[PDB]
Amino acid sequence: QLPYLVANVVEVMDMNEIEDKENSESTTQGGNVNLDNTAVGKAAVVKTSSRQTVFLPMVGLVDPDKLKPNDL
């Protein structure tokens, strides 16, 4: 329920999903065993109309089918 910010989506650049034993990312990190330590799931970058961008972990109820790399 209201109010919430209205924005557009920069891109979906996903990270690999969480089932692994060593990291669950697409970009290699230092150190070994990780799954939730600094590892994260799929990624959505969104651009505000307050004029920034934030790297958020996208909600797991909203699909990549409901996301286009311009979607409002």
Partner: peptide
Amino acid sequence: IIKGKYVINLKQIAKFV
């Protein structure tokens, strides 16, 4: 107007529901 909430864009340009 969304039929049965509304989208406003403020003068502070900043969009809210």
